[PDB]
Amino acid sequence: MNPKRIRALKSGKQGDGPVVYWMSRDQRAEDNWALLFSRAIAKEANVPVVVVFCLTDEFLEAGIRQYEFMLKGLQELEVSLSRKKIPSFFLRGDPGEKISRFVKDYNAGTLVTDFSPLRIKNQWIEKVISGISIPFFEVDAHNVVPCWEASQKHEYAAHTFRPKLYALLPEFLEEFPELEPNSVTPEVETLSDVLETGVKALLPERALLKNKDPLFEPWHFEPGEKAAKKVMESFIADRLDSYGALRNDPTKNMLSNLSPYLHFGQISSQRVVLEVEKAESNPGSKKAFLDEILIWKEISDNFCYYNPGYDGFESFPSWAKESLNAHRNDVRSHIYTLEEFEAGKTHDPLWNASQMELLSTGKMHGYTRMYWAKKILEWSESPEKALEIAICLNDRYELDGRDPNGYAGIAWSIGGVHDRAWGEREVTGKIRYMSYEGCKRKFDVKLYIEKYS
Numbered sequence: 001m002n003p004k005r006i007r008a009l010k011s012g013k014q015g016d017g018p019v020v021y022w023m024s025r026d027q028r029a030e031d032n033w034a035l036l037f038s039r040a041i042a043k044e045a046n047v048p049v050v051v052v053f054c055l056t057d058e059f060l061e062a063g064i065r066q067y068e069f070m071l072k073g074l075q076e077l078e079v080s081l082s083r084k085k086i087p088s089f090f091l092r093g094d095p096g097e098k099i100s101r102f103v104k105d106y107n108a109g110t111l112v113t114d115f116s117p118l119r120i121k122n123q124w125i126e127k128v129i130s131g132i133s134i135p136f137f138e139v140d141a142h143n144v145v146p147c148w149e150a151s152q153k154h155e156y157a158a159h160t161f162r163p164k165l166y167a168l169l170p171e172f173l174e175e176f177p178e179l180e181p182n183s184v185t186p187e188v189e190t191l192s193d194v195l196e197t198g199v200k201a202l203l204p205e206r207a208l209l210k211n212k213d214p215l216f217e218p219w220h221f222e223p224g225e226k227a228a229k230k231v232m233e234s235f236i237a238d239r240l241d242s243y244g245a246l247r248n249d250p251t252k253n254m255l256s257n258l259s260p261y262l263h264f265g266q267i268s269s270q271r272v273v274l275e276v277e278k279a280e281s282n283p284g285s286k287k288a289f290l291d292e293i294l295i296w297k298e299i300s301d302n303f304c305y306y307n308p309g310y311d312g313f314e315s316f317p318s319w320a321k322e323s324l325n326a327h328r329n330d331v332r333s334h335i336y337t338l339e340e341f342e343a344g345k346t347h348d349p350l351w352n353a354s355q356m357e358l359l360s361t362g363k364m365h366g367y368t369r370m371y372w373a374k375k376i377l378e379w380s381e382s383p384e385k386a387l388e389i390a391i392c393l394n395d396r397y398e399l400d401g402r403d404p405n406g407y408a409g410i411a412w413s414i415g416g417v418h419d420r421a422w423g424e425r426e427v428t429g430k431i432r433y434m435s436y437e438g439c440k441r442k443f444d445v446k447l448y449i450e451k452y453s
Ligand SMILES: Cc1cc2nc3c(=O)[nH]c(=O)nc-3n(C[C@H](O)[C@H](O)[C@H](O)COP(=O)(O)OP(=O)(O)OC[C@H]3O[C@@H](n4cnc5c(N)ncnc54)[C@H](O)[C@@H]3O)c2cc1C
Pocket: 247, 255, 256, 257, 258, 259, 260, 262, 263, 292, 293, 294, 296, 297, 300, 364, 365, 366, 367, 369, 370, 372, 373, 394, 395, 398, 400, 401, 402, 403, 405, 406, 407, 409, 410, 413
């Protein structure tokens, strides 16, 4: 167990009670460094380990598609943890008040949580730190190489972060030890009732079409830790050989479809890398898939961790801020409102088809995700308005939304973060441009539009 994966958030006197794992980002029992580190400290203190999850008040800012996907995986996780004699407690409310009350009520000895560079997680950490007196640690269980160890600053390009991450792969790319169960079972509400009351509160804002029928189709991705492993096994056996050649074709289902599991932490990215590395397939396809799940995935955490305003215009590179400022007063071809973007009522059938795939499946194709956001910048009144519209529609309808990948992905498309300067155009400036005619020369756009009417 590498001590470089764990950081100390607050020092204090350790109590004589159970070690608490404040689970948040990595919702899984297997291949979880944060849960394994909590079990090791629990063994050294001759005390059991407990898992605590907080059902926050911000769930109403999303939809039923994310609430059901997360809770149905937590129901399976509670059974998995119970088989390891590890009790799980699901609190409802503010993490600042619930975690502080749980630590005092249960005589917690040490508090451990997983790492997340998002602003809302740092908001919870500041509140919990102010209300506890026991040691507080955090463990990077989402990245193969810890986010604070891969780079000590913001990396402006993938060609500068790739050699840093690959040089540390021989040290941090390792097999996971088995989660040892608690020696004996130690001393809030049923998740089925929390799911029923939560869905009832989200029903008035459910995405529907004109026939009052729901738009979301929940049979595309089954939630859970067991279903995540089956999707990974199917990708290595059926789709990994053709990933390098068909990853940019939205008409082909050649992607791994692992992002909804990778977002909620239902499967470990280090586990996927370990199985892909030992798989015999196309070397160009393995290099392309490892460049997405390792470089681009962990450089998104590096972008959110070293840029406080990762969701703002100030985080864009200087060349892009100067270019977008010089074209602020350019007359846009079209100006669509948030409701017109949300309903897919633009003049572009390819953009509307990309929005319908987002509304119906909760997972838009990776290639169309770039064209979907770059047209928001082209058809908005300002780059700041384009950021708000792109972040709103991403976090609301994408099953993998509210993720550092989404913010770093939106920043790449609109602000050119981790990109270079291209030919200077009007409105968009030197930001990389994606045209409708360019997509037609890359894939069958007519089949993608007809699939999502
Ligand atoms: C406008 C826009 C919005 C996006 N929204 C999200 C989002 O809300 N949540 C999210 O997790 N990703 C987002 N992405 C990144 C990317 O599109 C998705 O990660 C990818 O499509 C997820 O589907 P997949 O797992 O089948 O892709 P795969 O090709 O099978 O890759 C597997 C994993 O590699 C990682 N990965 C792949 N592509 C990227 C990428 N471009 N950036 C970062 N990591 C990547 C992901 O972790 C992904 O799960 C967004 C990109 C853009 C341009």
